[model samples]
Target: ALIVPYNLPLPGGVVPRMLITILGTVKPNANRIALDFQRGNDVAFHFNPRFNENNRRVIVCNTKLDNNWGREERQSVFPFESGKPFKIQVLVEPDHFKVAVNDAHLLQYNHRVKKLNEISKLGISGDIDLTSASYTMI
Candidate 1:
């Protein structure tokens, strides 16, 4: 797991979200991807697929949370398949987090708090070997 310090300033009094770049080829055998962020228990985000695929790319955000999972959506970005990798950007504001896959796919999740704070830890957990990863404050 790669831990990076994200100190991007967010709007004061609003919860902050983050945009994560999935840097590497998502192997077919890769089980799921975890974006462990530094937030409270009340935090949550939505996962939207940027690409379309027959099989679902299993993803879990908060490892501590049991309700983390992917599902069919009303609309998708492109195709989410194994072996092919793309960008998964998270639009983090003060209140909620809108995660977009390849800038097309989107998922909305809420942060734990409504105040500004520094994020010093980032955890990535998945079955595939990572090539690159970046965290951007939104």
Candidate 2:
């Protein structure tokens, strides 16, 4: 999914200890890429990697519920290169998600919604070529 954002309705949603992997490549002149775990139109987790910030590359995280977005967790550590393939791993925990980028420990996002089973979709979008996506139901 490129201009056409792809969405997968997770069967039975997700659970604690479940793992998900997303593989893709950044476009040479990429602006940003978005990955979301959602419930209907509400966002449970939002992951966005940006390239064209004021001068720093950054990754942002947040959660939206009832049409309200939480504070952004933007980090300046960039591990992705243009025209290069990257891997993202997500380990769903009871209270937070452990994320890894390019096989390195990346960040943690705490669950804001609390109900893990409500995150019914996995969404992808932005200036990158999505290669593959896989998940492990724990």
Candidate 3:
């Protein structure tokens, strides 16, 4: 799989009920995958799945401010499987972002950066083969 990165520009920024969909496949020996929402140099949200970080079973979520890392929210119930194709969906809410993996509810990230409109960029990177990615205002 190629290490391709995607930078999706969000016009007017993220709003309530915005949806994000991503389709990809994991490498058999993949170590990580990350989706980040950016507002300038700060990351409004960072969704990361680490295959080797916690015995191959952890998903880490956090934000970065002023080049400083925020408190990490780690979940043990990972929905991604290596060497397999997967779909991930994210729904933006007023207070948080809800995520679903392969059509199943996965997690939620509360707005650490509060103003949704500040998140004008979406970034996708890391160890998997990314096939398709899109965002919709719903």
Candidate 4:
């Protein structure tokens, strides 16, 4: 049960139109894996995938502010498999964040925190072995 979190510094912060990509593998028996676009204490986007449980296979997207969690957008598509690698890309748009898993369109999250540049950090955690994480502005 080793949980390693990777934090990458977003130099100059995230621009209005940027792309964040994550490469990793889900460990066998993994409970979950999460990617967060953080702006100080506020989370602009929270991308989470939960595996095998009462929640069943699902992806939960949401935001957090002042320790209060916002409404969650749950999707039935669980594109990740235990013991398999995954590629997740998040494209920051003017009004929302578009996401794709394994090169397939996944879901989108509206900008809860409108200030895109404030999201100066990207974090990934849970039972995942990360290969790479990087961002590029459009």
Clashes of 4: 0
Which run of 10 residues does model 1 get worst, by summed lDDT? Answer: 4-13
Off by over 4 Å in 1: 1-18, 39-79, 114-118, 136-138
Candidate 3: tens digits of C-alpha lDDT, residues 1-138 = 334788888887899989999889987988999999998889999999998864666899999999998999988888898899999898999899999999999999999997788899889898789888888878
**Which pairs in model 2 have colliding backbones?**
none
Most accurate candidate by lDDT:
3
Residue ranges of candidate 2 with Cα displaced over 4 Å: 1-4
lDDT of 2 at 82: 84
The local distance difference test score of each candidate is 0.47, 0.87, 0.89, 0.86
How many pairs collide in each candidate, listed in order?
A: 17, 0, 0, 0
Off by over 4 Å in 3: 1-3
> What TM value does model 2 have?
0.93
Model 3 — TM-score against the truth?
0.94
Q: Could you give me the TM-score of model 4 versus the true structure?
A: 0.93
lDDT of 3 at 22: 87
lDDT tens per residue, model 2, 1-138: 433377767777789889999888888888998889998888999999889888679999999888999899988778888899999999999889889998898999888877788788999888888888879876
Model 4 lDDT tens row, 15-127: 76788888888999899998888999888789989896595988889999998899999999888999998899988887889999899999988888877778888889988
